[PDB]
Write a protein that binds this ligand. Structure first.
Ligand code: SF4
Ligand SMILES: [Mg+2]
Ligand SMILES: [Mg+2]
Ligand SMILES: [Mg+2]
Ligand SMILES: [Mg+2]
Ligand SMILES: [Mg+2]
Ligand SMILES: [Mg+2]
Ligand SMILES: [Mg+2]
Ligand SMILES: [Mg+2]
Ligand SMILES: [Mg+2]
Ligand SMILES: [Mg+2]
Ligand SMILES: [Mg+2]
Ligand SMILES: [Mg+2]
Ligand SMILES: [Mg+2]
Ligand SMILES: [Mg+2]
Ligand SMILES: [Mg+2]
Ligand SMILES: [Mg+2]
Ligand SMILES: [Mg+2]
Ligand SMILES: [Mg+2]
Ligand SMILES: [Mg+2]
Ligand SMILES: [Mg+2]
Ligand SMILES: [Mg+2]
Ligand SMILES: [Mg+2]
Ligand SMILES: [Mg+2]
Ligand SMILES: [Mg+2]
Ligand SMILES: [Mg+2]
Ligand SMILES: [Mg+2]
Ligand SMILES: [Mg+2]
Ligand SMILES: [Mg+2]
Ligand SMILES: [Mg+2]
Ligand SMILES: [Mg+2]
Ligand SMILES: [Mg+2]
Ligand SMILES: [Mg+2]
Ligand SMILES: [Mg+2]
Ligand SMILES: [Mg+2]
Ligand SMILES: [Mg+2]
Ligand SMILES: [Mg+2]
Ligand SMILES: [Mg+2]
Ligand SMILES: [Mg+2]
Ligand SMILES: [Mg+2]
Ligand SMILES: [Mg+2]
Ligand SMILES: [Mg+2]
Ligand SMILES: [Mg+2]
Ligand SMILES: [Mg+2]
Ligand SMILES: [Mg+2]
Ligand SMILES: [Mg+2]
Ligand SMILES: [Mg+2]
Ligand SMILES: [Mg+2]
Ligand SMILES: [Mg+2]
Ligand SMILES: [Mg+2]
Ligand SMILES: [Mg+2]
Ligand SMILES: [Mg+2]
Ligand SMILES: [Mg+2]
Ligand SMILES: [Mg+2]
Ligand SMILES: [Mg+2]
Ligand SMILES: [Mg+2]
Ligand SMILES: [Mg+2]
Ligand SMILES: [Mg+2]
Ligand SMILES: [Mg+2]
Ligand SMILES: [Mg+2]
Ligand SMILES: [Mg+2]
Ligand SMILES: [Mg+2]
Ligand SMILES: [Mg+2]
Ligand SMILES: [Mg+2]
Ligand SMILES: [Mg+2]
Ligand SMILES: [Mg+2]
Ligand SMILES: [Mg+2]
Ligand SMILES: [Mg+2]
Ligand SMILES: [Mg+2]
Ligand SMILES: [Mg+2]
Ligand SMILES: [Mg+2]
Ligand SMILES: [Mg+2]
Ligand SMILES: [Mg+2]
Ligand SMILES: [Mg+2]
Ligand SMILES: [Mg+2]
Ligand SMILES: [Mg+2]
Ligand SMILES: [Mg+2]
Lengths: 208, 82, 99, 138, 137, 122, 148
RNA sequence: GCUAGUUGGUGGGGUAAUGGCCCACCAAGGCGACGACGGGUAGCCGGUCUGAGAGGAUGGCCGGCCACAGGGGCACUGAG
RNA sequence: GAGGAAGAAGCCCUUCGGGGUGUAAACUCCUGAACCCGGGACGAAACCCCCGACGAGGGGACUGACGGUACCGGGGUAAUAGCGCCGGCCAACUCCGUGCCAGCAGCCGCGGUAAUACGGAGGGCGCGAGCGUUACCCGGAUUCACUGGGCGUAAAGGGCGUGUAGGCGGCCUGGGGCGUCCCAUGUGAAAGACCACGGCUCAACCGUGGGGGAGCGUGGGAUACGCUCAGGCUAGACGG
RNA sequence: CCGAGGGUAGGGCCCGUGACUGGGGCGGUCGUAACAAGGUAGCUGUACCGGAAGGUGCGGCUGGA
């Protein structure tokens, strides 16, 4: 299953804050604020020119790592995109976004995808009033991404909810707070998002 | 002889028959002569039957004898109403 | 339908039967160029009226012996000994393809 | 490794009896097993994967060298006494450091006798036997 | 001679890369119908049915672009490329669905059919096909 | 070649040769050791490699490499083997699979244990 | 200004009495990503000099390449003496499907969506010089009609 | 280079039925470098796998046809 | 899972100042895979009996292997991680040991006292209930080249003619319509593949619908090119 | 009558193997033929000879002067 290990080292080699921890990432106690070189014995060693392939590897690993998904599940998604009509890039990221547990986090129900996954798994979320414990659910435009209202009386949903009374979830989303619902109206546009990922370099990865 | 019956398709604990006319002495799921409509016993979507009544007539007339639960689904959607 | 093909009689030396050479053309499955192939048919002449050079058509038919499953539908062109040699000169060419 | 135990026998005087179970502290016979050998523990699947106390004692007392005559059928013997060694675990095959001959070793004359006599009259073996060669020196 | 057609286009090609004002090819209706095309598509200025020692020829009036600036003055070509496709060795015949699509549009591929010596854009609109005669860009 | 020539002669499809014939198409084969000595390799190397000549159940006799440091193999060792030549060695075209049959794993092996037939150190 | 990517650095050698003397060579593509590219090959007795000299002739040798939405107007196939490069026009969703050599010279041509394939000698120099001449040969509906 | 039921014919047996399928007689034919005869290997297709494609490669499971039921030969009963 | 130090211990590295593993652990709290109780199926409505007419339509009854399982509800413990690789290709670097030994190896090659190429270690890269290897098929292989290759010197022009079969074959008009092209029609089973929707909490799996193509049979049609037949030329070829 | 097949006799094709023998691929002894005009220009088809590379005749090629 998921990567589960030490998770600062990830960004460290990745030359980029991937916001994986959630409540501590903004804190100046984060790893990347203090040591933004790669992990282990050779970080402050003067980097070597990165091969074209390194470049695409490193870059693909960046994304794959963000959504904290297996290389198996990831490629199968990416593979779906190509054959889907139109732009492999967008659609991937799209389909990559259109998966449950990353919804749950874009709607600040939980703090990181890591915390988000646990939410979905533990049944503490629901879609259309039906409980759904599967971190993979391809959420489709229209759905009613609740919280199990038997799981409404719980210290941690409250916490993260309460801290989302009027921040703005992406255009494609509608956090009806208080009642702990949400809604997924629109699979993202390319422009609709930013993450430290050149959407094309991944396509060039698997083009090998 | 020539027969109307349910040739099972689908999967394990996922029945999905496919009522059909074939030559008795086939394999159940064998080469059928002609499809005349499905049937989903567990009733998992509104359409768990759609006998092509226009047809089911033609076969009963030139020979086809049916399962004592093919009529059940055939009589259900009355190919039999006078 | 009963298949109809067309050819020259290359052998009348049979009793109530003739040999009828048939070319068909088509392109090569890989190389596209058009090729000829040909196939000699044993065809039923009940009235023994078909002779050499006799370009004729033959019709698919109910069998009359072994490998005689066509009969001649009609005389179409006659006396084409040039296609008779076009075969006999190849046929005869065989005597020098031995060892 | 894991094994199926299809049926359980019990040998009587004049008949075999089928049984459905053997309680602790009782002997009988099981059909089904395939990789099993004498000197081996055996437990139900989800149990303390313990190994029973092996056994252990006497080293062989008599030693006899065997010569594979000729010669592409030495190894008719090579696979012969590997079938043997899990059948009898008291003889001991060895090949000599110097001199390079094959040295079956045993629990006694008699023991070597039949083992040898088998090796031929049951495996054909093109071979003869006798006194081991001596590793000399200058 | 074995391929009058190839000879022709190859008279053009041969003559253009040395920038002859015109070139004469021996005559045929079928050759004209194709020449009619080159002109009508802007590959040549045009052609006429002249005469040498009383043997019907067609003069073909070639066409280029400007002189260019640099160490190579020589004008870019109007007919850049023009090769036989169907051939006496290998006949090539396309259906309408099969009809190829030259240089992503900017070139053509003349093709004999039972409705004239059209072009690829033409045949698609005239709904037929045939012996893919050559291709030009 | 002209188009007639290919109508005529065709083109010849390539026929690949096996480099492990003695496998008879198998993934691995079992054998009994007929000889276990060492051998020297060719220029520019220089060593004493540990080979075993092995009688296969396909009834081929072949000679196989033994990987690792130290082996427990000898005459009459029932062994299992795999495709894999050894470059420096004339006529070795298989390896012994370590940790199978009478093939021991390797004492004190820590990295790449799987390729040397070696269980995991507690 | 432009962007530079060295494509090929390499150390050749000449012979003279009492030993071999070297002479580093290097092949560098230069570009805008908006339509202007260039390739130059400088060789000096030291790596960087050449790497910078290659860049001098790089700018001193540029190419049009007119993009159609991040792609080429017409499939082209130029052979540069044994080396032969093939460029195909590709949809917005594809990518830069090329080598490293065509890949660089395509990326900094601001190509984003191409299909390519190196036949022949795949010598990086020669393949480079080839992908260049092929770009230089590109044309649009306009120039095509202009000439007609 | 292949061929004496070999290729054709008349007549007859046989079959649900055509036929050198089988039998008598007559003719002297039939096939072959477009590869006969012979030797090797193979159950065939829907498909499957790969490939940009053209193409290669492959036929387990599932669906269809074939073929065999320890090796052969036979016939019975029967709509079969 | 969230928090959790300018960052414990041990180990690794060091120019001996420090660097690394490392927020990783400990530690705080929050959720709660397993398990424990309680309920508990869809798959099964016909065959039959009853009114009717043994028909149409109506009504009544029996029957579940899997299964006390799926799922639903209550309670509810921090709860397996492993394999390959880290000279180049190819992503990942140091110390020690070894000293053409032991070994590695897919190819190039590496090992003869300072080995990022063997062996261990720390660290690192990649995958993750899997990771590697062996065998085989297609790919890379435009290296049997139809798409899409070649033959002066790299493998490759026959020692040279003459000619059989074969392949190919000038310019004009016409007949035929064999190739070739066009429309219609039949066939191209079901599964699969493909696009849409939907059933299992997702997916794999599975159901419904759509879209069909090649290829062949049949009918109609076109006539340029290829063919064929008929006639004419004289630029090829032959002859005086 | 045919007929499984059994037998008798003579052939043909393949596979395994064989005292001994032929060269071939891989990992010291004798000469120095080739590579510079390689110290006799080289190679060549053939022929005869010589421990060996080779030499020599005839004729050929330049990929030699
Ligand atoms: S804190 Fe969040 S952002 Fe900073 S390193 Fe750890 S994970 Fe990356
Ligand atoms: Mg609870
Ligand atoms: Mg790919
Ligand atoms: Mg034929
Ligand atoms: Mg007859
Ligand atoms: Mg008869
Ligand atoms: Mg053993
Ligand atoms: Mg050496
Ligand atoms: Mg060495
Ligand atoms: Mg042993
Ligand atoms: Mg220059
Ligand atoms: Mg070239
Ligand atoms: Mg190379
Ligand atoms: Mg321009
Ligand atoms: Mg009769
Ligand atoms: Mg017969
Ligand atoms: Mg007879
Ligand atoms: Mg006679
Ligand atoms: Mg055969
Ligand atoms: Mg056989
Ligand atoms: Mg077989
Ligand atoms: Mg390819
Ligand atoms: Mg190929
Ligand atoms: Mg099947
Ligand atoms: Mg049989
Ligand atoms: Mg049996
Ligand atoms: Mg039998
Ligand atoms: Mg500090
Ligand atoms: Mg510490
Ligand atoms: Mg420290
Ligand atoms: Mg943690
Ligand atoms: Mg609790
Ligand atoms: Mg029920
Ligand atoms: Mg009644
Ligand atoms: Mg219960
Ligand atoms: Mg189950
Ligand atoms: Mg519960
Ligand atoms: Mg814990
Ligand atoms: Mg790996
Ligand atoms: Mg890799
Ligand atoms: Mg690297
Ligand atoms: Mg030190
Ligand atoms: Mg040592
Ligand atoms: Mg290793
Ligand atoms: Mg060292
Ligand atoms: Mg050294
Ligand atoms: Mg190391
Ligand atoms: Mg290595
Ligand atoms: Mg590929
Ligand atoms: Mg391959
Ligand atoms: Mg090859
Ligand atoms: Mg070709
Ligand atoms: Mg080549
Ligand atoms: Mg030469
Ligand atoms: Mg010559
Ligand atoms: Mg000769
Ligand atoms: Mg001729
Ligand atoms: Mg002709
Ligand atoms: Mg003509
Ligand atoms: Mg027609
Ligand atoms: Mg279908
Ligand atoms: Mg659904
Ligand atoms: Mg369907
Ligand atoms: Mg005429
Ligand atoms: Mg007999
Ligand atoms: Mg016999
Ligand atoms: Mg008998
Ligand atoms: Mg012999
Ligand atoms: Mg000499
Ligand atoms: Mg000399
Ligand atoms: Mg000399
Ligand atoms: Mg010389
Ligand atoms: Mg001589
Ligand atoms: Mg002498
Ligand atoms: Mg002499
Ligand atoms: Mg001479
Ligand atoms: Mg010279």
């Amino acid at each position: 299953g998921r990567y589960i290990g030490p998770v600062c080292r990830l960004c460290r080699r990745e030359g980029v804050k991937l916001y994986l921890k959630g409540e501590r990432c903004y804190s100046p106690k984060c790893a990347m604020e203090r040591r933004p070189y790669p992990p282990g014995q050779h970080g402050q060693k003067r980097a070597r020119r990165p091969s074209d392939y390194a470049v695409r590897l490193r870059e693909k690993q960046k994304l794959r790592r963000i959504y904290g998904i297996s290389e198996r599940q990831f490629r199968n998604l990416f593979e779906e995109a190509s054959k889907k009509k139109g732009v492999t890039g967008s659609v991937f990221l799209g389909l990559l976004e259109s998966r449950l547990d990353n919804v749950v986090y874009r709607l600040g129900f939980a703090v990181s995808r890591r915390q988000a996954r646990q939410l979905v798994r533990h049944g503490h979320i629901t879609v259309n009033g039906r409980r759904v414990d599967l971190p993979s659910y391809r959420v489709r435009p229209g759905d009613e991404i609740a919280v199990a209202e038997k799981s409404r009386n719980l210290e941690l949903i409250r916490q993260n909810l309460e801290a989302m009374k009027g921040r703005k979830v992406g255009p494609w989303l509608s956090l009806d707070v208080e009642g702990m619902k949400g809604k997924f109206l629109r699979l993202p546009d390319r422009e609709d998002l930013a993450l430290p990922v050149n959407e094309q370099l991944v396509i060039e990865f698997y083009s090998r | 002889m020539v027969k109307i019956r349910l040739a099972r398709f689908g999967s394990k604990h996922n029945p999905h028959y496919r009522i059909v006319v074939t030559d008795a002495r086939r394999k159940r799921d064998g080469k059928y002569i002609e499809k005349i409509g499905y049937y989903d016993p567990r009733k998992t979507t509104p359409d768990w039957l759609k006998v092509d009544v226009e047809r089911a007539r033609y076969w009963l007339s030139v020979g086809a004898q049916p399962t004592d639960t093919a009529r059940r689904l055939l009589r259900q959607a009355g190919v039999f109403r006078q | 339908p009963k298949k109809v093909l067309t050819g020259v009689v290359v052998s009348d030396k049979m009793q109530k039967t003739v040999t009828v050479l048939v070319e068909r053309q088509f392109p090569h499955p890989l190389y596209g160029k058009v090729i000829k192939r040909s196939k000699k048919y044993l065809a039923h002449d009940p009235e023994e009226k078909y002779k050499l050079g006799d370009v004729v058509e033959i019709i698919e038919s109910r069998p009359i012996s072994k490998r005689k499953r066509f009969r001649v539908l009609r005389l179409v062109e006659s006396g084409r000994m040039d296609l008779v040699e076009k075969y006999l000169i190849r046929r005869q060419n065989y005597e020098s393809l031995s060892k | 490794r894991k094994e199926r135990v299809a049926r359980l026998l019990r040998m009587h005087a004049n008949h075999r009896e089928e049984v459905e179970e053997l309680k602790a502290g009782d002997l009988g016979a099981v059909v089904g097993l395939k990789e099993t050998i004498t000197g081996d523990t055996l437990v139900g699947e989800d149990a303390p994967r313990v190994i029973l106390e092996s056994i252990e004692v006497p080293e062989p007392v008599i030693d006899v060298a065997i010569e594979p005559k000729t010669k592409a059928d030495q190894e008719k013997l090579s696979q012969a006494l590997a079938r043997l060694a899990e059948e009898d675990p008291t003889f001991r095959v060895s090949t000599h450091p110097e001199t390079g001959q094959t040295i079956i070793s045993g629990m006694g004359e008699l023991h070597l006798e039949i083992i040898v006599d088998r090796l031929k009259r049951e495996f054909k073996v093109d071979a003869n036997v006798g006194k081991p060669q001596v590793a000399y020196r200058e | 001679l074995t391929d009058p057609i190839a000879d022709m286009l190859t008279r053009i090609r041969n003559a253009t890369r040395v920038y002859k004002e015109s070139t004469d090819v021996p005559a045929s209706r079928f050759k004209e119908e194709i020449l009619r095309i080159l002109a009508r598509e802007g590959f040549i200025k045009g052609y006429e049915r002249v005469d040498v020692d009383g043997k019907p020829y067609l003069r073909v009036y070639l066409k280029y672009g400007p002189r260019r600036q640099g160490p190579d003055p020589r004008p870019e070509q109007v007919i850049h490329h023009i090769r036989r496709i169907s051939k006496p060795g290998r006949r090539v015949y396309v259906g309408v669905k099969e009809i190829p699509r030259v240089r992503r549009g900017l070139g053509i591929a003349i093709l004999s059919t039972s409705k004239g010596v059209l072009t690829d854009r033409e045949a698609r609109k005239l709904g037929v096909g045939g012996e893919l005669i050559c291709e030009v860009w | 070649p002209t188009i007639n020539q290919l109508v005529r002669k065709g083109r010849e499809k390539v026929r690949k040769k096996s480099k492990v014939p003695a496998l008879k198409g198998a993934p691995f084969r079992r054998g009994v050791c007929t000889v276990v000595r060492t051998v020297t390799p060719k220029k520019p190397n220089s060593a004493l490699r540990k080979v075993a000549k092995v009688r296969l159940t396909s009834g081929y006799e072949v000679t196989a490499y033994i990987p690792g440091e130290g082996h427990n193999l000898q005459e009459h060792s029932v062994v299992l083997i795999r495709g894999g030549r050894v470059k420096d060695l004339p006529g070795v075209r298989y390896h012994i699979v370590r940790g199978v049959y009478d093939a021991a794993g390797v004492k004190d092996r820590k990295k790449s244990r799987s390729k040397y037939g070696t269980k995991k150190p507690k | 200004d432009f962007e530079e990517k060295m494509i090929l650095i390499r150390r050749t050698a000449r012979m003279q009495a009492g030993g071999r003397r070297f002479r580093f060579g290097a092949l560098v593509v230069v570009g805008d990503r908006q339509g202007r590219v260039g390739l130059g090959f400088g060789k000096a007795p030291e790596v960087p000099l050449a790497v910078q000299k290659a860049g001098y002739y790089a700018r001193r040798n540029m190419v049009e390449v007119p993009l159609q939405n991040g792609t080429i107007p017409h499939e082209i196939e130029v052979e540069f003496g044994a080396s032969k490069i093939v460029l195909k026009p590709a949809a917005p969703g594809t990518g830069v499907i090329a080598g490293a050599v065509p890949r660089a010279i395509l990326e900094l041509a601001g190509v984003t969506d191409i299909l390519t394939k190196e036949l022949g000698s795949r010598n990086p120099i020669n393949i480079a010089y080839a992908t260049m001449e092929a770009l230089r040969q590109l044309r649009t509906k306009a120039d095509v009609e202009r000439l007609r």
